[PDB]
A paper describes a structure:
Basement membranes are extracellular structures of epithelia and endothelia that have collagen IV scaffolds of triple α-chain helical protomers that associate end-to-end, forming networks. At the C-termini, interactions occur between the trimeric NC1 domains of two protomers, forming a hexamer of these domains reinforced by sulfilimine cross-links. Recent studies in one of our laboratories revealed that the NC1 domains function as recognition modules, directing the selection and assembly of α-chains into protomers and networks.
Chloride ions were also present in our α1NC1homo, α3NC1homo and α5NC1homo structures at two different positions in the protomer–protomer interface. Our crystal structures of the α3NC1 and α5NC1 homohexamers provide the first view of the arrangement of the EA and EB regions, which are known critical components of two epitopes that reside in the dissociated α3 and α5 subunits of native α345NC1 hexamers. In the homohexamers these regions are exposed on the surface and are presumably unreactive to antibody binding, as they are in the native α345NC1 hexamers. In Goodpasture’s disease autoantibodies directed to the α3NC1 and α5NC1 domains are generated. Anti-α3NC1 autoantibodies are found in most Goodpasture’s disease patients. The preference of Goodpasture antibodies to recognize the α3NC1 chain could be explained by its sequence composition, although the recent description of Goodpasture’s disease with autoantibodies reactive exclusively to α5NC1 opens the door to additional factors being implicated in pathogenesis. The very recent report of the existence of the α5NC1 homohexamer in vivo gives credence to the view that the canonical α1NC1 and α3NC1 homohexamers presented here may also exist in vivo, particularly given their structural stability, their proper binding of chloride ions for hexamer stabilization and their correct disposition of the residues that mediate the sulfilimine cross-linking bonds that stabilize the hexamer. Solvent-accessibility analysis of residues at the EA and EB epitopes in the α3NC1 and α5NC1 structures, in comparison to the corresponding residues in α1NC1, showed similar exposed surface areas in either monomers or hexamers.
Residue numbers in the entry:
A (entry chain D): 2 to 228
B (entry chain F), F (entry chain B): 3 to 228
C (entry chain E), D (entry chain A), E (entry chain C): 4 to 228
């Protein structure tokens, strides 16, 4: 029998992901990272049911004022979703309508018998689950993100959401009330850094790496469940 | 009972009741967020943190590196969920005792299992997952902004993202100088009700007024495992 | 049973897990980071606030050109500090001289959920019936530093209940390797209130060293028995 | 002699240059833009506040990959408005229906520099000795809209002295082509003060339609003769 | 001829207009305001930086419901200060007790444009060929206070050249009527550089009371002769 | 001359020439804006303030209420107009002296009358008004953002809003730690070229790449009164 501890897994592809062994699916949906309303970012924990919306839309929210008037998609607000590996058109222009379907990551909301946590190494090595815990999946340490106006937020390192299984320099898409989505130059992803186990307490060594050797410098992580 | 604490908010002057199967720990006033040095920080409305037993327009102070602290001695803010009580004709701020009819009430409860929230994104109430029990039905409350457009939101997994009465203006702005008021830039953000067939379609801009607002709001339930 | 929380020493000493709980690992007290001038914090009552490796730059960023940078711009990190004071030149510190300054933490596992309770008065609040006291502390709500960026703690969380009150509970650290206290470094605490005066206009108060804990709300971290 | 300034009608009528000055051109009243959520304004008393062609998106941005985007993200523009009121439905407007809403301006050239003088009282301030009055108005100091971004006018500039007081002197316009008034659109004005009451605590005051101009500071725009 | 500028005493004394210029009025040194958490400043070398009447709340705001509020929310105003020290209790001040802390200013009229010149060294820069010196000072570039909001001065403007260097050149004032210095109140100045190696890594430097002026860039305000 | 000072920017390592009729006062390096304590403050590119004689990555310092000043001892920024010099393939920041080939140069000039800017909002060059003389042609440069998306802009009335050489990346980000680089979030804002035949209709979204950029940029002239 289950116990009431709900968490989420994200495919980061168009494929609906599988719940790890021992856990049961509740429902599936699309990977919902954060919104920007009136230029204020608010995010969802990627390891909770909040990060998995049944319905996709570029505008999942509305706002209301003190005159008792509400507006939906009637101003310049934002929403952000985890993306697939799918490429953007050569023209570099935004996309609208059903052409977005290949771009949005999918998620499964799962229920387990115990709490699921995440563990981080800060090194290239996979961290071990604590004693008495079971491994659910391997991943990379995903800490925070900024996009337009450099607004954004992050994930709790204790949460399964801080451990993405596919590393991507661009893990998310910027979407608008007017119906468009795109990657933009100021879209940033922040990750915990892989560090030298010998070099503690010294000036960090500035480092700039390019495609092909990026995972070389990313902290690793595991999501674990109590037995 | 097993240690899973959550909160219910009346959104009226009435102290709310804990749902069947849960036990009250204490009661207090509905505490949404603060603004210190122009930085918003909020509390999860489904956790004990959103229920303070002692109301005040200034529940906090700040301290510097010269070991000097100040209470209510600068322009900082606090925010509380409000009642349906309307504001005086003059549109001026209120101070002192006259605030009592405006502050929402809360009860901190204890249950045998975790309480989560489920959202539909449609006008229909979502079902609790298999093996879960309904605690209350409500509306999907996601974020909020006020002065300097600062603010934060609720976790959609949390009971706090599911308010039982919908209000265009669910909160009051309060100041260290002792005053509170609704302001033009006070905004509430809610998950939108969507048409089931039109997924991956350009959203249709919509502007609705009093009397037909609840109509475009996403619905939710708070559920506890059995 | 699976309920993980963290304790913070606020000294160079590695803290002890409370009665009935087992240590998972120890590390350094990690409060928050500032990337591209956006603050993001960790809950001080969860394993996230306790990193095994200390560094002034625990993170990196990557762009849409598939290029990543580590400590190659002006980003920040923040850690809870010890009572160690700063060199009188008032200049920043680098390298291994930082060790006496960084607070320490132990990640613990318990049989049940640990919550925090707050009084809003100088009196210690009682644990709800059926709950056990883990430690008593002060109500820590939020914090700002550079650009007045920052975040806070959940009052429900063990993290909102620091055992040692300090006007300056954290250090500002930089990618270039330096750390220091700065004038705009602020700590926010729940205020101690007079019980017989609710719904009355707050009385502005300014207190100095020796007098500070007099106006701080008190708290307890409790676990279900 | 080369001293250029601007006058704003705040109506659909193209304004007249004051006596002794010559028109250079006319256009639409351009207040400020918001790109990537950063406000930048134009001085309302300089030719920059008068754009020949109106559009809801007068600008574009370019990145380091040598790619530029026009009206392809969520950016803003702001224009001084007319007294024309908005539709029943409270929805935004697009297209040609915007005409009746955008204020007109004329760029003028004078023989001397034009300045503004402010009273901080209900009384019109006198031009300094040897200066000539160009127009009367109200002391307009700053403004905020979405994200509470915005900027203001220099009080030394003609731009800080609007001839027609309006609670809502400007319209918020978008790259998607729409414009509207919004609840968080604010206008800031220098306040009319009691002459006896200096270094006294300010008296909080809230006024409604019909009594608003009682509390606004007055101003004159003057040119050297 | 119509070229208006301002001089600031930075004391309780009403300053004198420089040789060849005429006083038009005097007042109090007005730096910037914060409405709805947005800073907007005045150029310290223009008449806007010199307000006839002092108050902690020189402005009001109005919404789209045609409702205006004066001193009825948490807004700010900022003024240049005197060398007057603050009471030992470190608490804010209200009322007429503020009189000894607000700097004074004189608005002057000259025959030609007044500009500022900066050295980036400890040496006083020379006026360009055909220009006359009005005063000597220090290079004042920007400032931040609450929420780290603020703005600065144009280096071309007389306002970027303060005659008296002060680590704390301004006071923070509130709608509720109080003013004080705060820990996060910051002044930014152009730095004095040693002429030999340009394009070389800046040397981090931290100095305290008694030598501060050794590292500040110098400036002169000049008028065309 | 009569006392009207303005600046010209080469946008190259070459010290620019004052336009005919004007006299040089001095020269220096093209200084755009700074970021202290995460607040941007800029200089007008058409005034002497945009031209500093001594380049440095940290032209400023800050002081607190304890009478303590710090120079280059925190994370602050400075921004300068750049040259067409490209960056090393490693994409890493530069320090010290590999820096000179990157900083734009400027000349501060004195004229007999006021120098203004005129903008077309079309691909055509705008004519100087009646009785005014052309100093140079250029492109309409309105604002800029970089780190934290902080930034400011130029006055369209000012010579500074009219850059002679269009660049997607007109400026470099420099730091107190001594480094400089282009970054992804470095943005330049320009007035757009518009279809004359349309006014008051939807803007047509447009995305344009290298080779076709100046096609959509508004044009400008800097003029002086005769
Ligand atoms: Cl929208
Ligand atoms: Cl882009
Ligand atoms: Cl306060
Ligand atoms: Cl209001
Ligand atoms: Cl960094
Ligand atoms: Cl400092
Ligand atoms: Cl746009
Ligand atoms: Cl609205
Ligand atoms: Cl106020
Ligand atoms: Cl302070
Ligand atoms: Cl620095
Ligand atoms: Cl970058």
């Amino acid at each position: 029998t289950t116990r009431g501890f709900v968490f989420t897994r994200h495919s980061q592809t168009t494929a609906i992901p599988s719940c790890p062994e021992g856990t049961v699916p509740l429902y599936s949906g699309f990977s919902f990272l954060f919104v920007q309303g009136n230029q204020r970012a608010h995010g969802q924990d990627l390891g909770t049911l909040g990060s998995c919306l049944q319905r996709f839309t570029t505008m999942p929210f509305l706002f209301c004022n003190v005159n008792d008037v509400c507006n939906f998609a009637s101003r310049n607000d934002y929403s952000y979703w985890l993306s697939t590996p799918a490429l953007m058109p050569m023209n570099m222009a935004p996309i609208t309508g059903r052409a977005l379907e290949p771009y949005i990551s999918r998620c499964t909301v799962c229920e387990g018998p115990a709490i699921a946590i995440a563990v981080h190494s800060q090194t290239t090595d996979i961290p071990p689950c604590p004693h008495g815990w079971i491994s659910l999946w391997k991943g990379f340490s995903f800490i925070m993100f900024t996009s337009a106006g450099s607004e954004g937020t992050g994930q709790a390192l204790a949460s399964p959401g801080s451990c993405l299984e596919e590393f991507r320099a661009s893990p998310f898409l910027e979407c608008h009330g007017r119906g468009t989505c795109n990657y933009y130059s100021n879209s940033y992803s922040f990750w915990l850094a892989s560090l030298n186990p010998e070099r503690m307490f010294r000036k960090p060594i500035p480092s700039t790496v390019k495609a092909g050797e990026l995972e070389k410098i990313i902290s690793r992580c595991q999501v674990c469940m109590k037995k």
